Structure formats: structure tokens, C-alpha cells
Symmetry: D2
Subunit: 235 residues, 4 copies
Amino acid sequence: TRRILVTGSSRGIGKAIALQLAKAGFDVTVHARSRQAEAEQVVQEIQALGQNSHYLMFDVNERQTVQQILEQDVEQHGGFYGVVLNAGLTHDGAFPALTDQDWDEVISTSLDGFYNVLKPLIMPMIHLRKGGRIVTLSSVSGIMGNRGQVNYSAAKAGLIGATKALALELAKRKITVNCVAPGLIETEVKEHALKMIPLQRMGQVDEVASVVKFLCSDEASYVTRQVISVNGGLI
Amino acid sequence: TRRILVTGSSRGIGKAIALQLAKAGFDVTVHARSRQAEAEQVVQEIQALGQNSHYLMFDVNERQTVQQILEQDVEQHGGFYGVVLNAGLTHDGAFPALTDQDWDEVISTSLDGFYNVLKPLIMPMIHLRKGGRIVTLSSVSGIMGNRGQVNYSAAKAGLIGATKALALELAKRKITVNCVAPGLIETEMDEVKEHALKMIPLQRMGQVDEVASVVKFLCSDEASYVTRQVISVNGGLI
Amino acid sequence: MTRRILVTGSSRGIGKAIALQLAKAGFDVTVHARSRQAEAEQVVQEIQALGQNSHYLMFDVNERQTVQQILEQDVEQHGGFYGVVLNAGLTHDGAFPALTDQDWDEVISTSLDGFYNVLKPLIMPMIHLRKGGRIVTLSSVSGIMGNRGQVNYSAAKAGLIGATKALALELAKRKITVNCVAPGLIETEVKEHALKMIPLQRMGQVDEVASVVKFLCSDEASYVTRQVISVNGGLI
Amino acid sequence: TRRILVTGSSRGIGKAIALQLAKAGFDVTVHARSRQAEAEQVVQEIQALGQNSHYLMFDVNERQTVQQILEQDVEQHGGFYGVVLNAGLTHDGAFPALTDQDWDEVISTSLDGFYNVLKPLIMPMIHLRKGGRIVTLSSVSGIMGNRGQVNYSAAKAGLIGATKALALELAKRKITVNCVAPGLIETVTDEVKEHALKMIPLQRMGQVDEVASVVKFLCSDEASYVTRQVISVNGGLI
Ligand SMILES: NC(=O)C1=CN([C@@H]2O[C@H](COP(=O)(O)OP(=O)(O)OC[C@H]3O[C@@H](n4cnc5c(N)ncnc54)[C@H](OP(=O)(O)O)[C@@H]3O)[C@@H](O)[C@H]2O)C=CC1
Ligand SMILES: NC(=O)C1=CN([C@@H]2O[C@H](COP(=O)(O)OP(=O)(O)OC[C@H]3O[C@@H](n4cnc5c(N)ncnc54)[C@H](OP(=O)(O)O)[C@@H]3O)[C@@H](O)[C@H]2O)C=CC1
């Protein structure tokens, strides 16, 4: 059974992605950085849906640790057919007010996390000889920029550049590589949503997960190199 | 049962869209300009799947005829929950070589067609009080341009602008409005297969169902937060 | 002989500012208007006082055969145009259900019929100069992103972008660059809405748009083609 | 006189930018990582053009060293009115074949370089109370991605997002912030020349001044309503 890894799937959008993929019939490996009990709960819910699941715990920034965990996981359970890079991080503030840690942790969590998670997994995916699916989670801010988020905008835009480049490299292997860029998602804010978003509301996590689930499906086999915005018309 | 009109659904991409929407559980109205026998065949295939279906024949450029046919159809069968504007036209040629007919017929079929079909249908859709779905079919050419296709590029680009603007107007009524922009799709048919191997990252033309599946997803209840978008289904071309 | 540029809709507004800047850059500039002949002649006088040759042409860009006859005769008398700026445009705003047939048709055709009707008689005279060339279309932020009450105008301005990009591909081998300038909200004749919605907190001035067109028409912009350049104060 | 810092301006695109800005009437501070003699030659050319100039030497990745050099320079010569961030590095290779150094050096040179150079300079620019100009140099690869360049594409795409976000924060100060994305620029074998002939609509690589002229326009007073933009100078590539 084809297996998909979803980073940051203990709660929020990542959890909703993991559950939709399980309902689609994929085996789903859960992941979290520190919330082991939440990850275990999602694992139980996936197993209740009739699919195999377990969790892995790592900070996507710990390069050598992520490699050891993923290589051991692929040896024990086979290569991943799909990977969803969902875990991200914000440290908001005006650009001259950002600290070094504000900047570095935000950039690396996205861009080093891309390298650290996917580099060990590309050849095991290719070796399944059945195509594959990679989906990254960016943001409206990675497309357009946002005040107080020069670091987050850079990180999520860089994720887009990496995703499009990787799509070109993996296309001949029938592996599609796409990005989903959510808008404002519910995880006086309702008044801002009423005023600024054409649909007049924040998105729900399943409205994002549905797009990821579609891209991971066999039906989406001619969609690659794309950034798909799920943002209620914001841009 | 929610009903969806698919223009140009007698064959090709539009037929695949129509069959996929029927399989998702929509009643589907088939449309063609002149190929009535193929339209009748698609209607029968949709009926055989367990959904209601009939066909409408019109040229989308005949503004007053289209209005009369659609108003009578809505009177008889209720408002459309969805409209997929798939019917299109090319007349390729270098810009100095294009004739008036080459230019006018390509621009109008996309832009007159958008107006002529949607204008009679907006209020019947809103009156359903359950949201709605509008999907237009553009092209990679409407995003980036293409040699020999200044007319088609303008026509398909103009469809993107109209789609995005209408998305803004209809969002408060829970009607999403999106565009699907295919790349090179195999609709039938050695040179064009080698051209696909070199130019397209996936190294092949797309199949009609690979376009129809994206349209089907956008028409589904699960795509309720996607609007104002151009979704490219092009094998990585751009 | 001096390179000559046609600016449609240059009797007033953005098109006038474009014509004056192109004259100051040393082009001969031909002024055009649909009906405001007195204003066209005043722009011609200013271009002449600026030191360049100028005259005006009057036509509705939708009158395909009349446009063809006027442009053919003008090129016969004065030579091919090195540049063409398609600036003249038209809005008929309103919610989509409120638009009349005329609201829709006049807006679509003024941009897309105008593109075809003005450029078809001029492309070969431009190519036959054998010195490259410049074509610039005026779109809008609405043609990129859409705007409420402007389904017709967004379609018209987005269609212009597609035409521009495709023609850039066809003409690149002749060293004719083809680009689009997409202004945001420009002051030509609300002020509080500008302060709230535009990062620069103000409307643009006509010369801020004209400066981009002038730059694209310059010899220095020889490697820029197929582009949509937004002049919008940060709006998108 | 308004002063502009151009990073990596001892040769190539950066040198062409520095010279064009001096001819436009700006004082221009040259920069290089190690090529000290080349930097001094550019300084002398700018002085001969009639503007004030000197050079600064640093690796944009050396965060605290850059901060100390720039703080001292602003102390001695005043805040910069403009900054042109020309800081990039490639380490090409198939993605699963990239080393840690291939990845990290490319990401950091662009994104650490943005932070390390611009953070010390934002407040001194604002304190001029005269507006300002920031231009970053990206690449067509940062817009569409490129095979063998997952690292460079991510680096150059991250620069675009940082630039757009910073444009939003500084717009109220009349500081415009824009990105220039060159295509293939002649900075050449027979193979490279032939690949330019076929991929690029203009059928040639760009020259350094064709890029510098766009930077120079953006830095001019006339470009005062252009901000948050990525302007591609690529011969029609995309
Ligand atoms: N095929 C491709 O590679 C690509 C296609 N597209 C777009 O996808 C859509 C479908 O592509 P394709 O499958 O080629 O279908 P076509 O674009 O070939 O149009 C075929 C359908 O449109 C109908 N049609 C054509 N002109 C009119 C008109 N004036 N009034 C009413 N109906 C009309 C035809 O009716 P009849 O059967 O009676 O002739 C037929 O049902 C089009 O919008 C096309 O531009 C975009 C990118 C690539
Ligand atoms: N002003 C703004 O805020 C913005 C404008 N734009 C675009 O910039 C361009 C100029 O804008 P603006 O300065 O407002 O001027 P307009 O767009 O109102 O066009 C005015 C000029 O176009 C001419 N014109 C109008 N219709 C026709 C026609 N059918 N045939 C021939 N000439 C015609 C007028 O001629 P006469 O003088 O005889 O009437 C006048 O010279 C347009 O393309 C517009 O869409 C885009 C974004 C914002």
C-alpha cells in the first residue's frame, strides 16, 4: 500500500491532510516535533480508518538526526510514495526589529526542512517505480509578501522556488511536485475576514486538506510545478 | 439535484468534464454548436450513469438566440448550479497573416461566449440559494502567449480577467469562479509526439481526463475555499 | 530620419504625458484622439515647441476600415512608425448583471479590436524600417487580478496582456520589443480610499506611468520584452 | 548628494550598475568580497565620472563583520539613500546529489546576505527623510525554477518574497523596494552561445548594461510609483 509522510500532522492543517489521505486509502505516517501524545492520537484515528500508521518525532532543522530517522524508517517500512511538507514557523516583527533567531529559525525551518526531509527520501521514492507525489505548504505571504513577515515571506517564497525546480527534476520519474498556498485559515479577526476576504470568512482546515488530497490523487497526474492558492479569493 | 451546464461537451475535453461531473452525482446538460449526433451520444452515456441529461444546441456568439434557449431551459428545468465554459476556438497564424475572421471569431467565441452564456444564468444560479460553481477553460497561451496565436492568447487571457473579476462579484453568494488552463492535451492523433517529449517536463501530452478531473474537483463541495484562481494543468510547461 | 512613435489617446491624461515624455526623449510623436481635436492640436503644439515633429490623427480605434485607411495614408506620407503605444481605453463600470450589451461590447472592442485595428496596418511598415521597434500596451491592475464592477474592463485589459505576450514572441526576431504597462489608480481628473488601500498611500501621477512607458521605448530597454510592468504603488 | 551601495560591483553586472548610477548623478560605494584591485579600479572610474566613491570589502555571509563595516561606513559618510543587493552564488547539481555545502552556501549567500546587508542600513536610510531605493537581483530561476538548481531557485525565490514584504513595510517612508530578475546574461563557449540562440526569443544572451539600465531606472526619481515589483530582464524567456 502506498505510504505518505505528512510533516507537522499532529494538529491543524497537517492533521486534516493526514486524515483525508488515510480516507483516500493511503497508509499515512504522522510526524510532530514535540507533541507525542497528539501524534499518537492522530495515529489512532488513521488506524481506525483501516490504514497503517505510526509517528516519527524530529525537528526538521536537525539535519543528521532527520536523515537517520528517515533512513531507518524507509528500511523498516519501504519508501514513501508521497511526502507533504507542512510544518512551518513564524517569528513576526518589523524587519529592523527582527532578531537573528527570528530570521534564521524562520528561513531554516522552511528551506533547511525542505532539504533535510526530502533529500533522504527522493531515491527511495523513485525506487518504488510507481511515480510519486510531493506537496509543499507555502502561504499567500510567499507569493505577495506581508508586513511584519519579511522572514516568513522569504521562507515561503523560497519554498515555492524549490518546489518548482524539483518538479522539473522529478517529472521524468512521474513524480509530481506542487505547492499549496493557503490564505487565512481558522486554526475581531472575523471582522477582518469579513472585510478583507472575498468569501468573507477564514478557511477551514479541511478546505486546505482537500486540495492537498486532490494533488496526491492519481487523477492529478498532469498537474506539476504549480502553486495552488486556497485563500477565499484574497489573491 | 444540482445541474451543471458544460458548453462544448459533445466531444474532447468538454465530454470528459461532462461524464466526470455526472459520475460525481450532478445532473449535466450537454451542449454543442452543430454536432447533434455526438451530443445525443453523450446525453445517453450520462443518462446510463443514473443522472438526468439533455442537450442544447447553439453558437455561443448568437447572443439573442442563446438568451432565449437558456431562459426557456431554466424555466423548464430550473436554474443551473454550475456552468463550465469549455467551448473554444483557434484560428492559428502569424499576426500579419491573420484575417479579420481569424481574429474576430477567436476573440468573440471566448469573450462574447462568456457574456452571452453567463448573463441569462447568473440570477437563476443565485436564486437556488445554495452557492454555485463557474469554471472557465483558458490555456497556457492565455498565461504566457504563444507564437502564431496572438488571437487565441488574447482570447484566453481575457477569459482569465473576466473569471477573476466575476469571482470577486459572486463570492458573497458562495459561488466560486475559477479558471482551468490546460497545456497540450491529446484529443486525437509522429512529430507532435516528439514535440511533447522535448518540451513538456512530463514528456507527454495530457489526457482529456487529466483536465476533466481538475474541473470536477473545482465543482465539488470540497473546493469551497478556492475562488479567483487559474489552475494550470500542463505537465509542468509553466 | 528621426524615429517616430504613435500614441493612441494622447489628447489628454496618461496618453498625453506619454507623448510629451517621448518627445523629450527625442522621438517624433504622432498624437491621436477619438474626437477631442482641439485638445489633440494643443498636444501637437507642445511637442513641436519641445523640438520634435508632430501632427495628430483622429479616429475611433473600433472603425477598422477607417483606421486602416488613415494609418496607411499616414505611413505613406511620413514613413513607418518605429514605435506604437496603445494607450486609448474605455471603461463602462457596473456589476455584471447590470452591464448592458453596449457596456460590454464597447469596452472589450476598444482594447482588443483596437489592438488589431491599429497594429495590423503598422507591423509591416515597422519591420521594414530594419532597425527594431517598440510596442507598448496599457493594461491595468484589473487586467491582472480582476476588479468588482469591471468584469468587462478586466477581460479587456487581461486580453491585452495575452495579445502583448504572444506578439512579443513573434516579433522578437526582428528586435521589436513588445511590453505592457499596467497602472494602478492614477490621478487624471476617493483620495481617502487611496490612503487606505495603496502601500504608497496615494494615487499615481500621469508622469509616473509615462516614465515607465518612456523607459521601455528607450534603446536601453532592448532586453526587456514579453513583460507586464505594474506601476501601482505596491497594490499588487 | 544621495549615495548608493552596490554589492559585488567590482565586475560584471554589479560594476555596470555602479557605473550607470554614477552617470545618473549618485555617489556610489563599491563592494567586493576579495577582488580588492578590481574594486579600486571601479572607484577610480566613478571618481573620474565626477562622483564620490570608495570601496568596502566583506563576505555578505559574515554577519557581525558586515554589521561593523556598514555601521562604521554610515558613521563616516552618512546613510545610504539606495542599496542594490547583488549577492548570489550557484552550486549546481541534481537535488539528491547536492552536498550540505552546495545547499547551505547558496541559500545563505542570498538570504543571509539580504538580512546581513540591509538590516544595518534600513534605519539610516529612513533617517535621511528623503525616501530611498532598494533593488535586489534575483533570477528567472527564482520565478520558475530550473533543473539542477533547486538550491539556487529557492534562494532567488526567497529573495523575491523578502523584497515584496519589505516594500510593504517601507512604502510609507517613500522608499521603493523592487527586484530585478535577469535571464541569461553574458558575464562564453560555443555550446552556451548556441543554447541562447534557441531558448531565448531575442536569440542572444543579455549584456550587463541591459540589466544595469533597469536597475538604474528603478533607482531614478521617475520610478517613484513602482514598488513591490519583480521586473524580468530576460529577452522574453518568460
Ligand atoms: N485541446 C487542447 O490541447 C487545449 C484545449 N484548451 C481549451 O479547452 C477547451 C476544449 O478544448 P477542445 O477539447 O479542443 O474543444 P474545442 O476547443 O475544440 O471546442 C470543441 C467544442 O466546442 C464547441 N464549440 C466550438 N465553437 C463553438 C461556438 N462558437 N459556439 C458553441 N460551441 C462551440 C464544439 O461544438 P461541435 O461539437 O458542435 O463543434 C465542441 O463541442 C477549449 O476552451 C480550448 O480552448 C486549452 C488548452 C489546450
Ligand atoms: N486613469 C487610470 O487611473 C488608469 C488608466 N489605465 C489605462 O491607461 C490608459 C489611459 O487611461 P486614461 O488616461 O484614463 O485615458 P482613457 O483610458 O480614458 O482614454 C482616453 C483617451 O483615449 C481616447 N479614446 C477613448 N476611446 C477611444 C476610441 N474608441 N477610439 C479612439 N480613441 C479613444 C480619448 O480620445 P478623446 O480625447 O477624443 O476622447 C482620449 O485621448 C487606458 O488604456 C486606461 O485603461 C489603467 C489603469 C488606471
